[PDB]
Design a protein around this ligand. Structure first.
Ligand SMILES: *S(=O)(=O)c1cc(C#C)cc(CN2CCN(C(=O)c3ccc4c(c3)ncn4Cc3ccccc3OC)[C@H](C)C2)c1
Ligand SMILES: *S(=O)(=O)c1cc(C#C)cc(CN2CCN(C(=O)c3ccc4c(c3)ncn4Cc3ccccc3OC)[C@H](C)C2)c1
Ligand SMILES: [Cl-]
Ligand SMILES: [Cl-]
Lengths: 304, 304
C-alpha cells in the first residue's frame, strides 16, 4: 500500500538551475532543461549522459517530447520556442511571436501542433511542420504557468498566476471552461490526466488539487509540501500503485496515495528546491531535478 | 461489483461473416474485417457508417489499428497483409511474404513494426515504411492464431493450434519463453495485459487463462462459455470495473470478474457465434461481432 522509491543514480552536467525533466514516451530517455540555455539527454534507466542540445540565447523554462520520442520542444526566455530533432540535434524550427518569456510548452498527441504559454499572458498554438503560429488566445491576465493538451488534442488546459485554469477548444480557439474554487491562489501548474477526465493543478498555497473536468468540481487535495514561489510540476504515477508526485521547496519529493491523499513517501537527497519531477511511462522510476544550489538530477526506483 | 452493459446500436452492412472488430486508440472509430474481403469503419459512439475499404482477395480474418489512429493493417486469406491509410482508403503497402493465409496482425506501440501470424506456421515482423519482412520466425508446429506486441514493444506473444504460446524478442527475434500447461489444447487467441505484464490465452477446451509469462505460471482461469473451434478474441476491460470480456460459440458475450473468475454478465442479442469483442479505450463501451448467420456488429454501454 506504500512505495519504496530509493535513490539509484545522480546525474550532473548542468551548470545552473534545472527547470524541467521529462521522460520520453518510449521510456528510453530523460530530457532536462536548465537556466544555462542547455537541454541534456540522459539514459532513462542508467542516468548515462547522452548528449547536449544547444541554440537558445537565454534560459529554458520547459522542454517536452513528441509522441514518437523523436522531437523536443523547448520554451526559452529568448521569447521563442525551438523544435529539435533529438537524434541529429538539429533545430528544425524556431517559433517566434511571443513578446516575452515563454514559460511552458507541449505537443499534442498527434504531435502536429505545439501549445505554449508566456509571461505575455497569451497561449499560442503552432504548426510543428511550418513553424507558423496558428492561433493566439487572450488567455489570462497574468503570466501563464502551464499548458497541456488532452488525450485527443481537442482541448487545452492552461493555468495562470491570475488564479485561473481554463480549458480551451483547440479547433475554435474558444474558452470552454474556467475553473475556480473557494479561493484563487496563483495556479503554478496544470495538466490533464491520461484519460482526459481529470485535471491536476498546483497552486502557490502549498496545495495540489484534482479536478473533475466535465463537472468542474474539485475531488481531492494533497498537502504537506512547500510550494509558495516556484512552478513545481506534479505527476500522475500509475505504473505501480497510484500516486501523485511533486517537487517541493523544502528539497524533498513528495508522493501521495492518489485516492486517500495521505503522504506515503518523502524522497530525501537534493540540496535546493525540487522544481521538477517526471514519472517513467512503463516503470516505477521517478526523476527529480533541483535549482541553483544543487544543479543535479536524481533517479529513484520503487517496487511499486 | 457487477456491470450493466445494455445494447445501444446494431450495425449491419457486411454481407458475410465478420471476423474482428477493433476500436481505434483515439476512441473515435471502430473497424471491422469480414470474409466478404472488406473493412468498414463506423463511428464508435453512435454507430454511424463511415466508409468501406476494398482491395483484398479472399477475405479478411483480422484488422488492427496503429498508435495514432491513422493506419489499418489487415491479415487476409490472399496470403498478404495490407496497410491502409484510414483517411483515403488507399492501400499503402501490400506486405507479401507469407506462403498461406494470414490470420492475425497487429502494430507495435511505436507503429513502425507490424507483426503477423499465418496458417503457414510462421510469424513475420514487417517494416511499415518499406513493407519488407525483417524477421521470419519458425514460430509454431501448426497455424498461429494470434500475435500481439506488449506495452513497451519489446516482446511479441504468439499462440497457435499447436497448443503453445511463445514470447519473442522484437529486437533479436529470439524465443524467450514457450508456455505449456498440463495439457496443450490448441491456443486460439492470446494477448498481453494492457500494462504488458501478463498474458491472456484462449484454448479450444472452452477456457481462458491469465498467464504470468516470466514465471511461466497460470494465475487465473475463466470458464462458463463455449469455445471449441473458432479464434475468438478476448479482452481486458479496465475503464470501469475490471473484467475479462470474450465472445462465445453460444452467441453470447461473456464478462467475468478479473479477480474472482466469476461470470458477471452474459449479453444476449447476437444470433451466431460471437467471433470478436473489443473494449473502448476511454468509455465503458463493448463492440461485438458475429459470424455468417448473424453478420451484425453490436455496441453495448455500461454505467460501470
Ligand atoms: S474517478 O473515477 O472519480 C477517479 C478518481 C481518482 C482519485 C482520487 C482516480 C481515478 C483513476 N483513474 C484511472 C487513472 N487515470 C487516468 O487518467 C489514466 C492514466 C493512465 C492511463 C489511462 C488512464 N489509460 C491508459 N493509461 C496508460 C497506462 C499506464 C500504465 C499502465 C498501463 C497503461 O495503459 C495500458 C485517472 C487518474 C483516472 C479515477
Ligand atoms: S499480479 O500482480 O499477480 C495480478 C494478478 C491479477 C489477477 C487475478 C490482477 C492484476 C491486475 N493488474 C492491474 C491491471 N492490469 C493491467 O494490465 C493494467 C494496469 C493498468 C492499466 C491498464 C491495464 N490499462 C490502463 N491502465 C492504467 C489505468 C487505467 C485505469 C485505471 C487505473 C489505471 O492505472 C492505475 C493487470 C491485470 C495487472 C495483477
Ligand atoms: Cl506530461
Ligand atoms: Cl484488452
Amino acid at each position: 500500500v506504500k512505495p519504496n522509491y530509493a535513490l539509484k543514480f545522480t546525474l550532473a552536467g548542468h551548470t545552473k538551475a534545472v527547470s524541467s525533466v521529462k521522460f520520453s514516451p518510449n521510456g528510453e530517455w530523460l530530457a532536462s532543461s536548465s537556466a544555462d540555455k542547455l537541454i541534456k539527454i540522459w539514459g532513462a534507466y542508467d542516468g548515462k549522459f547522452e548528449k547536449t542540445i544547444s541554440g537558445h540565447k537565454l534560459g529554458i523554462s520547459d522542454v517536452a517530447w513528441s509522441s514518437d520520442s523523436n522531437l523536443l520542444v523547448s520554451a526559452s526566455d529568448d521569447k521563442t520556442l525551438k523544435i529539435w530533432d533529438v537524434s541529429s540535434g538539429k533545430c528544425l524550427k524556431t517559433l517566434k511571436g511571443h513578446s516575452n518569456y515563454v514559460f511552458c510548452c507541449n505537443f499534442n498527441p498527434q504531435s502536429n501542433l505545439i501549445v505554449s504559454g508566456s509571461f505575455d499572458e497569451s497561449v499560442r498554438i503552432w504548426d510543428v511542420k511550418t513553424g507558423k503560429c496558428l492561433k493566439t488566445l487572450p488567455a489570462h491576465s497574468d503570466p501563464v504557468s502551464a499548458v497541456h493538451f488532452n488525450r485527443d488534442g481537442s482541448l487545452i488546459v492552461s493555468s495562470s498566476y491570475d488564479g485561473l485554469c481554463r480549458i480551451w477548444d483547440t479547433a475554435s480557439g474558444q474558452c470552454l471552461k474556467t475553473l475556480i474554487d473557494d479561493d484563487n491562489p496563483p495556479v503554478s501548474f496544470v495538466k490533464f490526466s491520461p484519460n482526459g477526465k481529470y485535471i491536476l493543478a498546483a497552486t502557490l498555497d502549498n496545495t495540489l488539487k484534482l479536478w473533475d473536468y466535465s463537472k468542474g468540481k474539485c475531488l481531492k487535495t494533497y498537502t504537506g509540501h512547500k510550494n509558495e514561489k516556484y512552478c513545481i510540476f506534479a505527476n500522475f504515477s500509475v505504473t505501480g500503485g497510484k500516486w501523485i508526485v511533486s517537487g517541493s521547496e523544502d528539497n524533498l519529493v513528495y508522493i501521495w496515495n492518489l485516492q486517500t491523499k495521505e503522504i506515503v513517501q518523502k524522497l530525501q537527497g537534493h540540496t535546493d528546491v525540487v522544481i521538477s519531477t517526471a514519472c517513467h511511462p512503463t516503470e516505477n522510476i521517478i526523476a527529480s531535478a533541483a535549482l541553483e544550489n544543487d544543479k543535479t538530477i536524481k533517479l529513484w526506483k520503487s517496487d511499486c
